[PDB]
Amino acid sequence: TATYAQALQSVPETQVSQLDNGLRVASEQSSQPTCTVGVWIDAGSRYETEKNNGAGYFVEHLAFKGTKNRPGNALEKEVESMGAHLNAYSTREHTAYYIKALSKDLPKAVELLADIVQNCSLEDSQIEKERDVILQELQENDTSMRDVVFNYLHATAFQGTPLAQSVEGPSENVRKLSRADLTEYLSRHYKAPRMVLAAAGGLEHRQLLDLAQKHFSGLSGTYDEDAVPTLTPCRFTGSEIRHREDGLPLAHVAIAVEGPGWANPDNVALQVANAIIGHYDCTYGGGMHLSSPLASVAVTNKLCQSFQTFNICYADTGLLGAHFVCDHMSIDDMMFVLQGQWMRLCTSATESEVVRGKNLLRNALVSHLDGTTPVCEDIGRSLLTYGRRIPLAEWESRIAEVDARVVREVCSKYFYDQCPAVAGFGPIEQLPDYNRIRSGMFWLRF
Amino acid sequence: VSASSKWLEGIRKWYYNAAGFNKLGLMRDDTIHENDDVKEAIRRLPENLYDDRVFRIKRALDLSMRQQILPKEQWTKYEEDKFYLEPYLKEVIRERKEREEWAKK
Amino acid sequence: MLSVAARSGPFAPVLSATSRGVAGALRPLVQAAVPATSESPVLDLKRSVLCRESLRG
Amino acid sequence: MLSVAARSGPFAPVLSATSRGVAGALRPLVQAAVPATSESPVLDLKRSVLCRESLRG
Amino acid sequence: VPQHPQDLEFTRLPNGLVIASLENYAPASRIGLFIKAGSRYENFNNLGTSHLLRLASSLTTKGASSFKITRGIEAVGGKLSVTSTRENMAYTVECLRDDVDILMEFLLNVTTAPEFRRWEVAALQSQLRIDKAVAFQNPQAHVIENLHAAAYRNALANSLYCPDYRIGKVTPDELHDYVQNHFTSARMALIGLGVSHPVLKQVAEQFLNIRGGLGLSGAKAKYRGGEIREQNGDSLVHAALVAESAAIGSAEANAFSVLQHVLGAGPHVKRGSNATSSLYQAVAKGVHQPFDVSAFNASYSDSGLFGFYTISQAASAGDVIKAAYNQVKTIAQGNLSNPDVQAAKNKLKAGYLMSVESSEGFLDEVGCQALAAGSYTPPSTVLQQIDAVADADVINAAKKFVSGRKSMAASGNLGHTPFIDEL
Amino acid sequence: GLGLSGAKAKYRGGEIREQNGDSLVHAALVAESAAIGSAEANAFSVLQHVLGAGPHVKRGSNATSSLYQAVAKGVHQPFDVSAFNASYSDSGLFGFYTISQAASAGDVIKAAYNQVKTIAQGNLSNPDVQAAKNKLKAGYLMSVESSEGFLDEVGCQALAAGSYTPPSTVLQQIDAVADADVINAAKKFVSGRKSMAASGNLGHTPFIDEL
């Protein structure tokens, strides 16, 4: 009808607002009878500093741990008895906390949110016990080894360097957890002005401001003092390591090359580029007909057991690229695939795919916009990073503006002659040297 | 393999009485020079067929070494020859015409 | 007036080639995540999961 | 006054290296040989049986 | 404002085909086809041919080249998957509305145009073994799914995989037959979301004629209740103990849903004691370690059972599962609050809410409307029917559950577990 | 050493149920018997002989048993049923190992149970009893016998006997054969929870609840 762009306009308009702190409250008022009530708990995975290690993960384990205004089982009473939703999704600089609710219920959890906002307590009982549930639950709770895979891509292939810094921090710290980390560094960290007032569902933004004043008001008012540095650019690790395992039965392999992060204007087409990249699913069938030529040969050659373009994020940089799975063989040709495909990419552009992955980002484009919570958090990081929202026709504009000249060129601009991430898991011998694999980082195809 | 085709396919019938194939009792389809298309073409061949062409082929080798041929009676029945692959083959002709097609696309 | 779906955490598979497979079907079973030593794996003869495509306006 | 054995056609294995394995144990099950199309196999990914050593004075 | 927002048009084709165009002015494209071809219609003549076909959409098609088909599918780059359910198999296309016709054509092709090529099929075989691999894979695909395989018992457990003994044996005869035997206007449900009821009617008309379904709900699928007993050696034991519920559409069905909520299930807010249920709160008071119990719904129109999926380490299985039954007994005591009942209606009714909800879990939930509802007894009427919540039948129901032969399901060694005869 | 005989090894009786896809079905339906050394043990051995087992002379109708003669009258195709002895000192069961194509499994196995019922009728001859003692007692004979199946039989003495209650005394104890307890026994077998065992698909077979 009014076409995908005039559908994009025909897709209704979200709105946003700024509460008086300078407080941020944005609204998507919908027909959602329930709603995702984001009280968007903005404490993320990377937001923290060196000796601050773990305090946000602890805080996560501390997030629902119980409080004063609502005790723990009481939080479970208003909340759980309400049958409501809470999450904590922690990211570089920010995070969120959902509330699924009757839009009717809209005030209640807002109230809850506020004490969440405030009354979260460090209880020398809990701090002994729930923090024996933190000391324990956390302490051994670590070991996720796809987080030694995908967060080998994050906790390894993303380095831990002050900017590369990992999430969970030390087990030494796990011993060393402090109220100074919580008594202090919760307060010494948690700072409302950055917190996000996040509105998703059927809703009244006027009422939003209202209840804001009612409960949510009086938050960032106490804020600032010291310690707010910026990101001094540097190099992330730039390496590889095999956790050297005969015990790794089959490679969970991977790779990535810049993934989104918050900032850069480029990633737009890089998105599209990553589209051209694409993720070759093991469970996916149809390899004979597979689109990613890589994927194709991978079928024909039976050339690997997985690859999935995976975008690793930091404002202006990252790595977006394939997971992978393979036996004693693939990796070599894989890069011959991958980098070569990249090489192929860096050269070979044909508008066809450009349009294809354009439609990819279109469908997908829904699938983020489409969905209540995806739209929700989408707002959350949308202003968090952006402070704006790429409108349907704005994102469909630079999107609409998509240019395959910038594919060849801009491709060369970001992509060419670099050393992004590659991490297998397991007996990596097919990993050539940086003097080979990253000699493969260079192209003698020309 | 009959008179026009016993002159012409009677390069395969009377003149493969001369050029041997059908009087050797060969399989028409089997005469296609092996190619990739031919290759996977056969890969898709029918089973009972596969046996058939097998016995044919081997035998051909057999008299070949023997440098003999079957009874001219035993020499193959003219015309009267299923085009074995040609449905399957020609199908593949469309196939590689298809891989070839969207390929062109 | 004809109904198939929703009770959260059982299995009635959903799979494709373009996509991957899964079954989230009616009934529970998802509650197990609690304990300490929360561990979790990767790297040996396995499958994993979780993909999707979602973007923007 | 201590008894283990004999009821013919069940299984309580007997095996060795020098020898091969078998179980002929107490209870039946051996009666199946009757029908026409009495067929029987060899030649594909299997084991077979039946050896022994017996001679003379 | 839309011209007053379009009410989804429910209809049945005069031919006896389910003719559903839900007018959606929404920007995207959502295309359902609900198929009686879900596992119910399945038959012991075959095995996993639905697991198969579930893979075999990609198969060589009549009049459509799975590679060329792959070129159109691959071309628009949209969402097309038929869905594997006990009730249905659902051909789904969510995409830009433009290609819909092509999609529709593809749809029309996808549904109506199998070639079932011997060669192709033979190839397809192995990818199944791969599939079953995924199926059983991980504590989700294993302890949940293979211990669905080790949970699911009856012809519903007729697998999203196939049988091992059946492995590799599929027949193209079984293909053209199977659909010819199974696929039918009896299985025909077409559901538009985003399109012209007129246009969907257009292709629908010039295209879709079919017929031909079949018989019955099961053995009473043989009611062994009782154990599907599995020696596992699961390390931490995975055992799940099966109560029962009620049939789809049964009067008490909703009530069963109550009892579900009564014992409840996974929380909407994470990281909690599971404070909410005698199955949980009294697993809380009751149980000190990893545990889970919950009620299914295996809803035939004919019958139903809501078990308890269970999770715990071996040592307490007698302890827990007995306590389970104990709490069950305790629960069946009829002791209940009113705020139990109402706040329940909040919890579970909200169940119907998010359960109904949003653009994907619209297409999966309001697409379990755009497939799986059939009308709105609205959150008005169905939550009126939900407001028709009544407690006592949950008491007499507590007896009813106490009253039957239900199942136990075993993953592990029972050395600490009960065998349910020794119960 | 150490302790105990089992769960009563958990008496599920009932099916060990196996989907096979066996082509020609292999199903075996389990009656029960008695414990090792039990007074009635020998009697169980009788009942065994009563239904009998594989013949000493090959190629025969299996003319000898209501399980067999009335599998003969009963059954027209490949079939087998026989009684085990799972002899704990503590407990025991003698099933019927069964063999037949799927189609008749309900037919046969039911007939099986039917014949079992028929058998449990207590109808028996005296020559049934005596000529039995010939057949099975001879069972103890070749069962006891010769240099290998000495070492395996008289070596089930040279291991597995422990004394000779001789073919004198044990075949006196065998001569202590008494029929009636095979009647009340016929009831006893009829009286328990026993097992069924499944190799195939039951589409023609009984599930023993539907029994």
Short mmCIF file of N, CA and C in Angstrom, two decimals, chain E residues 199-285:
data_model
loop_
_atom_site.label_atom_id
_atom_site.label_comp_id
_atom_site.label_asym_id
_atom_site.label_seq_id
_atom_site.Cartn_x
_atom_site.Cartn_y
_atom_site.Cartn_z
N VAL E 199 -7.90 -10.91 -2.34
CA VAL E 199 -6.81 -11.48 -3.12
C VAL E 199 -6.49 -12.88 -2.63
N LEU E 200 -6.31 -13.02 -1.32
CA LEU E 200 -6.17 -14.34 -0.74
C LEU E 200 -7.29 -15.23 -1.21
N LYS E 201 -8.48 -14.67 -1.37
CA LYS E 201 -9.57 -15.42 -1.96
C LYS E 201 -9.31 -15.68 -3.43
N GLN E 202 -8.53 -14.83 -4.08
CA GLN E 202 -8.34 -14.97 -5.51
C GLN E 202 -7.45 -16.17 -5.78
N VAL E 203 -6.21 -16.08 -5.33
CA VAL E 203 -5.32 -17.23 -5.41
C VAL E 203 -5.99 -18.44 -4.78
N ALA E 204 -6.58 -18.23 -3.61
CA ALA E 204 -7.26 -19.30 -2.91
C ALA E 204 -8.19 -20.04 -3.85
N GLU E 205 -8.97 -19.29 -4.61
CA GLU E 205 -9.96 -19.88 -5.48
C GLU E 205 -9.27 -20.59 -6.63
N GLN E 206 -8.54 -19.84 -7.44
CA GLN E 206 -7.95 -20.41 -8.63
C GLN E 206 -7.00 -21.55 -8.30
N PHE E 207 -6.74 -21.79 -7.02
CA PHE E 207 -5.68 -22.70 -6.61
C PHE E 207 -6.19 -23.93 -5.89
N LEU E 208 -6.85 -23.77 -4.76
CA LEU E 208 -6.50 -24.57 -3.59
C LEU E 208 -7.28 -25.87 -3.40
N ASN E 209 -8.15 -26.28 -4.32
CA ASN E 209 -9.07 -27.38 -4.02
C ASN E 209 -8.35 -28.65 -3.55
N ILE E 210 -8.95 -29.34 -2.57
CA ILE E 210 -8.44 -30.59 -2.01
C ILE E 210 -9.52 -31.25 -1.15
N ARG E 211 -9.23 -32.42 -0.59
CA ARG E 211 -10.09 -33.12 0.37
C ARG E 211 -9.35 -34.36 0.87
N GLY E 212 -10.01 -35.18 1.70
CA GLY E 212 -9.55 -36.54 1.97
C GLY E 212 -9.00 -37.06 3.36
N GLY E 213 -9.39 -36.48 4.50
CA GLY E 213 -8.86 -36.93 5.80
C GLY E 213 -9.25 -38.31 6.33
N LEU E 214 -9.03 -38.58 7.64
CA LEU E 214 -9.21 -39.92 8.22
C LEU E 214 -9.53 -39.85 9.73
N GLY E 215 -9.46 -41.01 10.40
CA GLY E 215 -10.22 -41.37 11.60
C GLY E 215 -10.12 -40.99 13.09
N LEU E 216 -9.07 -41.35 13.85
CA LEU E 216 -9.28 -41.56 15.28
C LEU E 216 -8.17 -41.02 16.18
N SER E 217 -8.51 -40.87 17.47
CA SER E 217 -7.71 -40.15 18.46
C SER E 217 -6.66 -41.00 19.15
N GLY E 218 -6.75 -42.29 19.07
CA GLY E 218 -5.71 -43.12 19.63
C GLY E 218 -6.30 -44.38 20.20
N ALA E 219 -5.45 -45.12 20.88
CA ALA E 219 -5.82 -46.35 21.56
C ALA E 219 -6.70 -46.10 22.77
N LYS E 220 -7.13 -44.86 22.96
CA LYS E 220 -7.15 -44.21 24.27
C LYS E 220 -5.70 -44.13 24.74
N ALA E 221 -4.94 -43.34 23.98
CA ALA E 221 -3.67 -43.80 23.43
C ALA E 221 -2.99 -44.53 24.53
N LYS E 222 -2.68 -45.79 24.24
CA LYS E 222 -3.13 -46.85 25.13
C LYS E 222 -2.82 -46.39 26.49
N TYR E 223 -3.81 -46.37 27.35
CA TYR E 223 -3.54 -45.63 28.56
C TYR E 223 -2.79 -46.62 29.42
N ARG E 224 -1.48 -46.49 29.38
CA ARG E 224 -0.61 -47.14 30.32
C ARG E 224 -0.40 -46.26 31.53
N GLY E 225 -0.78 -44.99 31.41
CA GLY E 225 -0.42 -44.02 32.39
C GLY E 225 1.03 -44.32 32.64
N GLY E 226 1.37 -44.40 33.91
CA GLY E 226 2.54 -45.13 34.34
C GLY E 226 3.83 -44.70 33.70
N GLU E 227 4.86 -45.48 33.91
CA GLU E 227 6.19 -45.09 33.51
C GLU E 227 6.39 -45.29 32.02
N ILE E 228 6.92 -44.26 31.38
CA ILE E 228 7.94 -44.46 30.37
C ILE E 228 9.23 -44.39 31.16
N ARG E 229 9.86 -45.54 31.35
CA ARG E 229 10.94 -45.68 32.31
C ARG E 229 12.23 -45.67 31.54
N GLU E 230 13.15 -44.80 31.92
CA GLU E 230 14.40 -44.64 31.19
C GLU E 230 15.55 -44.69 32.17
N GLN E 231 16.34 -45.75 32.07
CA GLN E 231 17.66 -45.72 32.66
C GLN E 231 18.49 -44.71 31.90
N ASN E 232 19.06 -43.76 32.62
CA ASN E 232 19.87 -42.74 31.98
C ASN E 232 21.31 -42.82 32.45
N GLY E 233 21.56 -42.69 33.75
CA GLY E 233 22.89 -42.33 34.14
C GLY E 233 23.07 -40.89 33.71
N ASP E 234 22.19 -40.05 34.23
CA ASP E 234 22.04 -38.66 33.82
C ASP E 234 22.96 -37.72 34.57
N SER E 235 23.90 -38.24 35.36
CA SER E 235 24.58 -37.43 36.36
C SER E 235 23.50 -36.86 37.27
N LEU E 236 23.33 -35.54 37.29
CA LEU E 236 22.17 -34.99 37.96
C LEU E 236 20.91 -35.53 37.29
N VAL E 237 20.04 -36.14 38.10
CA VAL E 237 18.97 -36.97 37.56
C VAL E 237 17.98 -36.10 36.82
N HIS E 238 17.44 -36.61 35.71
CA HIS E 238 16.34 -35.92 35.07
C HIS E 238 15.17 -36.87 35.10
N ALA E 239 14.25 -36.64 36.01
CA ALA E 239 13.08 -37.48 36.14
C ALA E 239 11.91 -36.53 36.02
N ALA E 240 10.82 -36.96 35.41
CA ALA E 240 9.64 -36.10 35.33
C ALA E 240 8.39 -36.94 35.59
N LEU E 241 7.57 -36.51 36.55
CA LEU E 241 6.47 -37.33 37.06
C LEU E 241 5.13 -36.75 36.62
N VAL E 242 4.31 -37.58 36.02
CA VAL E 242 3.21 -37.13 35.18
C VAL E 242 1.88 -37.28 35.89
N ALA E 243 1.34 -36.16 36.33
CA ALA E 243 -0.08 -36.07 36.58
C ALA E 243 -0.82 -36.02 35.25
N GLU E 244 -2.12 -35.70 35.30
CA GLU E 244 -2.97 -35.62 34.12
C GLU E 244 -3.86 -34.38 34.20
N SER E 245 -4.54 -34.04 33.09
CA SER E 245 -5.47 -32.91 33.15
C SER E 245 -6.87 -33.14 32.59
N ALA E 246 -7.00 -33.03 31.27
CA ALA E 246 -8.29 -32.85 30.61
C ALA E 246 -8.11 -32.63 29.11
N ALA E 247 -9.18 -32.80 28.34
CA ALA E 247 -9.12 -32.71 26.88
C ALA E 247 -9.19 -31.27 26.38
N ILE E 248 -8.65 -31.07 25.18
CA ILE E 248 -8.84 -29.79 24.50
C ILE E 248 -10.32 -29.50 24.40
N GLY E 249 -10.69 -28.24 24.59
CA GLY E 249 -12.07 -27.84 24.47
C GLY E 249 -12.96 -28.37 25.56
N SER E 250 -12.46 -29.25 26.41
CA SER E 250 -13.27 -29.75 27.50
C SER E 250 -13.78 -28.58 28.33
N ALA E 251 -14.97 -28.76 28.88
CA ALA E 251 -15.48 -27.77 29.81
C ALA E 251 -14.43 -27.44 30.85
N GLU E 252 -13.91 -28.46 31.51
CA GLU E 252 -12.92 -28.27 32.55
C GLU E 252 -11.57 -27.86 32.02
N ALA E 253 -11.36 -27.85 30.70
CA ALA E 253 -10.05 -27.54 30.15
C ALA E 253 -9.49 -26.30 30.83
N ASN E 254 -10.19 -25.19 30.68
CA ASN E 254 -9.78 -23.97 31.36
C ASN E 254 -9.46 -24.25 32.82
N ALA E 255 -10.31 -25.02 33.49
CA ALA E 255 -10.07 -25.31 34.89
C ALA E 255 -8.72 -25.98 35.06
N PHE E 256 -8.43 -26.94 34.20
CA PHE E 256 -7.11 -27.54 34.21
C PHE E 256 -6.06 -26.45 34.13
N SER E 257 -6.26 -25.51 33.21
CA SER E 257 -5.33 -24.40 33.11
C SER E 257 -5.18 -23.70 34.45
N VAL E 258 -6.28 -23.61 35.19
CA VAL E 258 -6.20 -23.05 36.52
C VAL E 258 -5.19 -23.89 37.27
N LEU E 259 -5.53 -25.16 37.50
CA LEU E 259 -4.68 -26.02 38.31
C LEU E 259 -3.23 -25.87 37.91
N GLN E 260 -2.98 -25.79 36.61
CA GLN E 260 -1.67 -25.41 36.13
C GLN E 260 -1.17 -24.21 36.89
N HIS E 261 -1.87 -23.09 36.73
CA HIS E 261 -1.46 -21.90 37.46
C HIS E 261 -1.32 -22.18 38.95
N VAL E 262 -2.19 -23.02 39.49
CA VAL E 262 -2.17 -23.30 40.92
C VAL E 262 -0.80 -23.80 41.30
N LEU E 263 -0.38 -24.88 40.69
CA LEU E 263 1.01 -25.25 40.83
C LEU E 263 1.92 -24.32 40.04
N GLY E 264 1.39 -23.57 39.09
CA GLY E 264 2.20 -22.64 38.33
C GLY E 264 3.30 -23.27 37.50
N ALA E 265 4.18 -22.41 36.97
CA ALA E 265 5.30 -22.79 36.12
C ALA E 265 6.35 -21.68 36.18
N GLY E 266 7.30 -21.68 35.25
CA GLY E 266 8.36 -20.69 35.24
C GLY E 266 7.89 -19.26 35.38
N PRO E 267 8.58 -18.48 36.21
CA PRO E 267 8.09 -17.15 36.55
C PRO E 267 8.32 -16.12 35.46
N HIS E 268 7.43 -15.13 35.42
CA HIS E 268 7.64 -14.02 34.50
C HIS E 268 8.81 -13.16 34.95
N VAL E 269 9.05 -13.09 36.24
CA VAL E 269 10.24 -12.44 36.77
C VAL E 269 11.23 -13.53 37.17
N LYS E 270 12.46 -13.41 36.70
CA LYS E 270 13.45 -14.45 36.92
C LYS E 270 13.91 -14.45 38.37
N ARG E 271 14.77 -15.41 38.70
CA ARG E 271 15.50 -15.46 39.96
C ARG E 271 14.56 -15.31 41.16
N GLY E 272 13.79 -16.37 41.40
CA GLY E 272 12.89 -16.37 42.54
C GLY E 272 12.75 -17.76 43.12
N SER E 273 12.29 -17.79 44.37
CA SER E 273 12.24 -19.02 45.14
C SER E 273 11.26 -20.02 44.54
N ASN E 274 10.55 -19.60 43.50
CA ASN E 274 9.35 -20.29 43.05
C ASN E 274 8.34 -20.29 44.19
N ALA E 275 8.12 -19.10 44.74
CA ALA E 275 7.34 -18.93 45.95
C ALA E 275 5.86 -19.21 45.75
N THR E 276 5.43 -19.53 44.54
CA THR E 276 4.03 -19.39 44.20
C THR E 276 3.20 -20.67 44.27
N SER E 277 3.74 -21.83 44.63
CA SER E 277 2.89 -23.00 44.49
C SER E 277 3.16 -24.07 45.53
N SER E 278 2.10 -24.75 45.95
CA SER E 278 2.30 -25.97 46.73
C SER E 278 3.20 -26.93 45.97
N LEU E 279 3.15 -26.88 44.65
CA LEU E 279 4.17 -27.58 43.91
C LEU E 279 5.50 -26.86 43.98
N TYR E 280 5.50 -25.59 44.35
CA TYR E 280 6.68 -24.75 44.25
C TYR E 280 6.99 -24.08 45.58
N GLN E 281 6.09 -23.23 46.07
CA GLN E 281 6.18 -22.77 47.44
C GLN E 281 6.37 -23.96 48.37
N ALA E 282 5.64 -25.03 48.15
CA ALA E 282 5.90 -26.21 48.95
C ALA E 282 6.90 -27.13 48.30
N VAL E 283 7.37 -26.81 47.09
CA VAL E 283 8.72 -27.21 46.75
C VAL E 283 9.72 -26.28 47.37
N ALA E 284 9.34 -25.05 47.67
CA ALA E 284 10.24 -24.15 48.35
C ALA E 284 10.40 -24.60 49.80
N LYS E 285 9.32 -24.55 50.57
CA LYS E 285 9.33 -25.19 51.87
C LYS E 285 9.74 -26.64 51.74
#
